[PDB]
Amino acid sequence: GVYHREARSGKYKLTYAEAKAVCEFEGGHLATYKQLEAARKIGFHVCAAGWMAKGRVGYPIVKPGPNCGFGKTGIIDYGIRLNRSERWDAYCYNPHAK
């Protein structure tokens, strides 16, 4: 059960700490790479850095955009950047997320 999530103020405003608090808020759990992958292959596409893993934020793109991803394939994750104080989206993952 993976679903994209944004900030109450707008995209690119959630920090690994905030992004999680939201997902874990409703007994949920941040989405990972492999997870967002199996969901990405089903149609999980979100042109925006989505927090994941212990603190890694990538850019999952199933449809190579012209100006968005410039033509990227799959999730574009490079790993943590040692700065959760960043601002992006938040990938949620709850068994029921209800």
CSV table of N, CA and C in Angstrom, one decimal:
chain,number,residue,atom,x,y,z
A,1,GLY,N,0.8,-1.2,0.0
A,1,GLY,CA,0.0,0.0,0.0
A,1,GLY,C,0.8,1.3,0.0
A,2,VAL,N,1.3,1.7,-1.2
A,2,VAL,CA,2.1,2.9,-1.3
A,2,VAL,C,1.3,4.0,-2.0
A,3,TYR,N,1.4,5.2,-1.4
A,3,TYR,CA,0.7,6.4,-2.0
A,3,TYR,C,1.5,7.6,-1.7
A,4,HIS,N,1.6,8.5,-2.8
A,4,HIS,CA,2.4,9.7,-2.7
A,4,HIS,C,1.7,10.7,-1.7
A,5,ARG,N,2.5,11.6,-1.1
A,5,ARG,CA,1.9,12.5,-0.1
A,5,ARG,C,2.7,13.8,-0.2
A,6,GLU,N,2.0,15.0,-0.1
A,6,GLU,CA,2.6,16.3,-0.1
A,6,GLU,C,2.5,17.0,1.3
A,7,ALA,N,2.9,18.3,1.3
A,7,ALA,CA,2.8,19.0,2.5
A,7,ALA,C,1.6,19.9,2.6
A,8,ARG,N,1.1,20.2,3.8
A,8,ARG,CA,-0.1,21.0,4.0
A,8,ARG,C,0.1,22.4,3.3
A,9,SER,N,1.3,22.7,3.1
A,9,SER,CA,1.6,24.0,2.5
A,9,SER,C,1.8,23.9,1.0
A,10,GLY,N,2.3,22.7,0.6
A,10,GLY,CA,2.6,22.5,-0.8
A,10,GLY,C,3.8,21.6,-1.0
A,11,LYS,N,3.9,21.1,-2.3
A,11,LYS,CA,5.1,20.2,-2.6
A,11,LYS,C,6.4,20.9,-2.3
A,12,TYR,N,7.4,20.1,-2.0
A,12,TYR,CA,8.8,20.7,-1.7
A,12,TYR,C,8.7,21.5,-0.5
A,13,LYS,N,8.2,20.9,0.6
A,13,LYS,CA,8.2,21.7,1.9
A,13,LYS,C,8.2,20.7,3.1
A,14,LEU,N,8.3,19.4,2.8
A,14,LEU,CA,8.4,18.3,3.8
A,14,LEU,C,9.8,17.8,4.0
A,15,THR,N,10.2,17.7,5.2
A,15,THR,CA,11.5,17.2,5.6
A,15,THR,C,11.4,15.7,6.0
A,16,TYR,N,12.4,14.9,5.8
A,16,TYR,CA,12.4,13.5,6.2
A,16,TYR,C,11.7,13.4,7.5
A,17,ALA,N,11.9,14.3,8.4
A,17,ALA,CA,11.3,14.3,9.8
A,17,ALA,C,9.8,14.5,9.7
A,18,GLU,N,9.4,15.5,8.9
A,18,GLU,CA,8.0,15.9,8.8
A,18,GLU,C,7.3,14.9,7.9
A,19,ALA,N,7.9,14.5,6.8
A,19,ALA,CA,7.4,13.5,5.9
A,19,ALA,C,7.0,12.3,6.6
A,20,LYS,N,7.9,11.8,7.5
A,20,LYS,CA,7.6,10.6,8.2
A,20,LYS,C,6.5,10.8,9.2
A,21,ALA,N,6.6,11.8,10.1
A,21,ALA,CA,5.6,12.1,11.1
A,21,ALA,C,4.2,12.0,10.5
A,22,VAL,N,4.0,12.4,9.2
A,22,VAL,CA,2.8,12.4,8.5
A,22,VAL,C,2.4,10.9,8.2
A,23,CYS,N,3.3,10.2,7.6
A,23,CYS,CA,3.0,8.8,7.2
A,23,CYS,C,2.8,8.0,8.5
A,24,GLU,N,3.7,8.1,9.4
A,24,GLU,CA,3.7,7.3,10.7
A,24,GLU,C,2.5,7.8,11.6
A,25,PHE,N,2.0,9.0,11.2
A,25,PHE,CA,1.0,9.7,12.0
A,25,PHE,C,-0.2,8.7,12.1
A,26,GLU,N,-0.7,8.2,11.0
A,26,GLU,CA,-1.8,7.2,10.9
A,26,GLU,C,-1.3,5.8,10.8
A,27,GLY,N,-0.4,5.4,11.8
A,27,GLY,CA,0.1,4.1,11.8
A,27,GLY,C,0.7,3.7,10.5
A,28,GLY,N,1.2,4.6,9.7
A,28,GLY,CA,1.8,4.3,8.4
A,28,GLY,C,3.3,4.2,8.5
A,29,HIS,N,3.9,4.0,7.4
A,29,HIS,CA,5.4,3.9,7.3
A,29,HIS,C,5.9,4.4,6.0
A,30,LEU,N,7.0,5.2,6.0
A,30,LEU,CA,7.6,5.8,4.8
A,30,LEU,C,7.8,4.7,3.8
A,31,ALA,N,7.6,5.1,2.5
A,31,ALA,CA,7.8,4.2,1.4
A,31,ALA,C,9.3,4.1,1.0
A,32,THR,N,9.8,2.9,0.7
A,32,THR,CA,11.2,2.7,0.3
A,32,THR,C,11.4,2.7,-1.2
A,33,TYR,N,12.6,2.4,-1.6
A,33,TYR,CA,12.9,2.3,-3.1
A,33,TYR,C,12.2,1.1,-3.7
A,34,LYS,N,12.6,-0.1,-3.3
A,34,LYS,CA,12.1,-1.3,-3.8
A,34,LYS,C,10.5,-1.3,-3.7
A,35,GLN,N,10.0,-0.7,-2.6
A,35,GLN,CA,8.6,-0.6,-2.4
A,35,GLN,C,8.0,0.3,-3.4
A,36,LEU,N,8.5,1.6,-3.5
A,36,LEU,CA,8.0,2.6,-4.4
A,36,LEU,C,8.2,2.1,-5.8
A,37,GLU,N,9.1,1.1,-6.0
A,37,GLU,CA,9.4,0.5,-7.3
A,37,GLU,C,8.2,-0.4,-7.7
A,38,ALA,N,7.9,-1.4,-6.9
A,38,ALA,CA,6.9,-2.3,-7.2
A,38,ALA,C,5.5,-1.6,-7.4
A,39,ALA,N,5.5,-0.4,-6.8
A,39,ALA,CA,4.3,0.5,-7.0
A,39,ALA,C,4.4,1.4,-8.2
A,40,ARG,N,5.6,1.7,-8.5
A,40,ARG,CA,6.0,2.6,-9.6
A,40,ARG,C,5.7,1.8,-10.9
A,41,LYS,N,5.9,0.5,-10.9
A,41,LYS,CA,5.7,-0.3,-12.0
A,41,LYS,C,4.2,-0.5,-12.3
A,42,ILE,N,3.4,-0.2,-11.3
A,42,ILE,CA,2.0,-0.3,-11.4
A,42,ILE,C,1.3,1.0,-11.8
A,43,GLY,N,2.1,2.1,-11.7
A,43,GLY,CA,1.6,3.4,-12.1
A,43,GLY,C,2.0,4.5,-11.1
A,44,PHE,N,2.9,4.1,-10.1
A,44,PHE,CA,3.3,5.1,-9.1
A,44,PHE,C,4.3,6.1,-9.7
A,45,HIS,N,3.8,7.2,-10.2
A,45,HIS,CA,4.6,8.2,-10.8
A,45,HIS,C,4.4,9.6,-10.1
A,46,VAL,N,5.5,10.2,-9.7
A,46,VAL,CA,5.4,11.5,-9.0
A,46,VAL,C,6.7,12.3,-9.3
A,47,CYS,N,6.6,13.2,-10.2
A,47,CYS,CA,7.8,14.1,-10.6
A,47,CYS,C,8.1,15.0,-9.4
A,48,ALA,N,8.8,14.5,-8.4
A,48,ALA,CA,9.2,15.3,-7.2
A,48,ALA,C,9.9,14.4,-6.2
A,49,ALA,N,11.0,15.0,-5.7
A,49,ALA,CA,11.8,14.2,-4.7
A,49,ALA,C,10.9,13.7,-3.6
A,50,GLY,N,10.8,12.4,-3.5
A,50,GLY,CA,10.0,11.8,-2.4
A,50,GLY,C,10.8,11.1,-1.4
A,51,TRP,N,10.8,11.6,-0.1
A,51,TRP,CA,11.5,11.0,1.0
A,51,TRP,C,11.3,9.5,1.0
A,52,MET,N,12.3,8.7,1.5
A,52,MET,CA,12.2,7.3,1.6
A,52,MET,C,13.4,6.8,2.4
A,53,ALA,N,13.4,5.5,2.7
A,53,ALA,CA,14.5,4.8,3.4
A,53,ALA,C,14.8,5.5,4.7
A,54,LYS,N,15.9,5.2,5.3
A,54,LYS,CA,16.4,5.8,6.6
A,54,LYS,C,16.6,7.3,6.4
A,55,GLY,N,16.5,7.8,5.2
A,55,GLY,CA,16.7,9.2,5.0
A,55,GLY,C,17.1,9.5,3.5
A,56,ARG,N,16.9,8.6,2.7
A,56,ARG,CA,17.2,8.8,1.2
A,56,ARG,C,16.0,9.3,0.5
A,57,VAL,N,16.2,10.3,-0.3
A,57,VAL,CA,15.1,10.9,-1.1
A,57,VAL,C,15.5,10.8,-2.6
A,58,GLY,N,14.6,10.2,-3.4
A,58,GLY,CA,14.8,10.0,-4.8
A,58,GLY,C,13.8,10.7,-5.6
A,59,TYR,N,13.8,10.4,-7.0
A,59,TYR,CA,12.8,11.0,-7.8
A,59,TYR,C,12.2,10.0,-8.8
A,60,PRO,N,11.3,9.1,-8.3
A,60,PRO,CA,10.7,8.0,-9.1
A,60,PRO,C,9.9,8.6,-10.3
A,61,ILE,N,10.3,8.1,-11.5
A,61,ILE,CA,9.6,8.6,-12.7
A,61,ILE,C,9.4,7.4,-13.6
A,62,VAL,N,8.2,7.0,-13.8
A,62,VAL,CA,7.9,5.9,-14.7
A,62,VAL,C,7.7,6.4,-16.2
A,63,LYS,N,7.5,7.7,-16.3
A,63,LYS,CA,7.3,8.3,-17.6
A,63,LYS,C,8.3,9.4,-17.9
A,64,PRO,N,9.4,9.1,-18.6
A,64,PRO,CA,10.4,10.1,-18.9
A,64,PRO,C,9.8,11.4,-19.4
A,65,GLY,N,9.8,12.5,-18.6
A,65,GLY,CA,9.2,13.7,-19.0
A,65,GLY,C,10.2,14.5,-19.9
A,66,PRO,N,9.6,15.5,-20.6
A,66,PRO,CA,10.4,16.3,-21.5
A,66,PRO,C,11.2,17.4,-20.8
A,67,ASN,N,10.5,18.0,-19.8
A,67,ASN,CA,11.1,19.1,-19.1
A,67,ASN,C,11.2,18.7,-17.6
A,68,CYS,N,10.4,17.8,-17.2
A,68,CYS,CA,10.3,17.4,-15.8
A,68,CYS,C,11.6,16.5,-15.4
A,69,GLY,N,11.6,15.3,-15.8
A,69,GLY,CA,12.7,14.4,-15.5
A,69,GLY,C,13.7,14.4,-16.6
A,70,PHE,N,13.4,15.2,-17.6
A,70,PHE,CA,14.3,15.4,-18.8
A,70,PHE,C,14.5,14.0,-19.5
A,71,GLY,N,13.8,13.0,-19.1
A,71,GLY,CA,13.9,11.7,-19.7
A,71,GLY,C,14.5,10.7,-18.8
A,72,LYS,N,14.2,10.7,-17.6
A,72,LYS,CA,14.8,9.7,-16.6
A,72,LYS,C,14.0,8.4,-16.6
A,73,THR,N,14.7,7.3,-16.2
A,73,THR,CA,14.1,6.0,-16.2
A,73,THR,C,14.1,5.5,-14.7
A,74,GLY,N,12.9,5.0,-14.3
A,74,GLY,CA,12.8,4.4,-13.0
A,74,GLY,C,13.0,5.5,-11.9
A,75,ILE,N,13.2,5.0,-10.7
A,75,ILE,CA,13.4,5.9,-9.5
A,75,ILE,C,14.9,6.5,-9.6
A,76,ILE,N,15.0,7.8,-9.5
A,76,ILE,CA,16.3,8.4,-9.5
A,76,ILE,C,16.7,8.8,-8.1
A,77,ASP,N,17.3,7.8,-7.4
A,77,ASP,CA,17.7,8.0,-6.1
A,77,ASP,C,19.3,7.8,-6.0
A,78,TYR,N,19.9,8.8,-5.3
A,78,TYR,CA,21.3,8.8,-5.1
A,78,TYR,C,21.7,8.5,-3.7
A,79,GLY,N,20.7,8.4,-2.8
A,79,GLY,CA,21.0,8.1,-1.4
A,79,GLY,C,20.9,9.4,-0.6
A,80,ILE,N,21.0,9.2,0.7
A,80,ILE,CA,20.9,10.3,1.7
A,80,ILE,C,21.9,11.4,1.3
A,81,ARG,N,21.6,12.6,1.8
A,81,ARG,CA,22.5,13.7,1.5
A,81,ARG,C,23.0,14.3,2.8
A,82,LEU,N,22.7,13.7,3.9
A,82,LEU,CA,23.1,14.1,5.3
A,82,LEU,C,22.5,15.5,5.5
A,83,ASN,N,21.3,15.7,5.2
A,83,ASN,CA,20.6,16.9,5.4
A,83,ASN,C,19.1,16.8,5.3
A,84,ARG,N,18.4,16.2,6.3
A,84,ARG,CA,17.0,16.0,6.2
A,84,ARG,C,16.2,17.3,6.3
A,85,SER,N,17.0,18.4,6.5
A,85,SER,CA,16.4,19.7,6.5
A,85,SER,C,15.9,20.2,5.2
A,86,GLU,N,15.9,19.3,4.2
A,86,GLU,CA,15.5,19.6,2.8
A,86,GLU,C,14.0,19.8,2.7
A,87,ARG,N,13.5,20.1,1.5
A,87,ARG,CA,12.1,20.3,1.3
A,87,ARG,C,11.7,19.5,0.0
A,88,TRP,N,10.9,18.5,0.2
A,88,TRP,CA,10.4,17.7,-0.9
A,88,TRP,C,9.0,17.1,-0.5
A,89,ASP,N,8.7,16.0,-1.1
A,89,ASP,CA,7.4,15.3,-0.9
A,89,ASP,C,7.7,14.2,0.1
A,90,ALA,N,6.6,13.3,0.3
A,90,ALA,CA,6.7,12.2,1.3
A,90,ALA,C,6.0,11.0,0.8
A,91,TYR,N,6.7,9.9,0.6
A,91,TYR,CA,6.0,8.7,0.1
A,91,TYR,C,5.5,7.9,1.3
A,92,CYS,N,4.2,7.7,1.4
A,92,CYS,CA,3.6,6.9,2.4
A,92,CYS,C,3.4,5.5,2.1
A,93,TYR,N,3.3,4.6,3.1
A,93,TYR,CA,3.2,3.2,2.9
A,93,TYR,C,2.5,2.6,4.1
A,94,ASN,N,1.2,2.3,4.0
A,94,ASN,CA,0.4,1.7,5.1
A,94,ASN,C,-0.3,0.5,4.6
A,95,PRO,N,-0.3,-0.6,5.4
A,95,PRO,CA,-1.0,-1.8,5.0
A,95,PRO,C,-2.5,-1.6,4.7
A,96,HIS,N,-3.1,-0.6,5.4
A,96,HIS,CA,-4.4,-0.2,5.1
A,96,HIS,C,-4.6,1.3,5.0
A,97,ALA,N,-3.7,2.1,5.6
A,97,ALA,CA,-3.7,3.5,5.5
A,97,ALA,C,-5.1,4.0,5.5
A,98,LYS,N,-5.9,3.7,6.6
A,98,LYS,CA,-7.2,4.2,6.7
A,98,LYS,C,-7.4,4.9,8.0
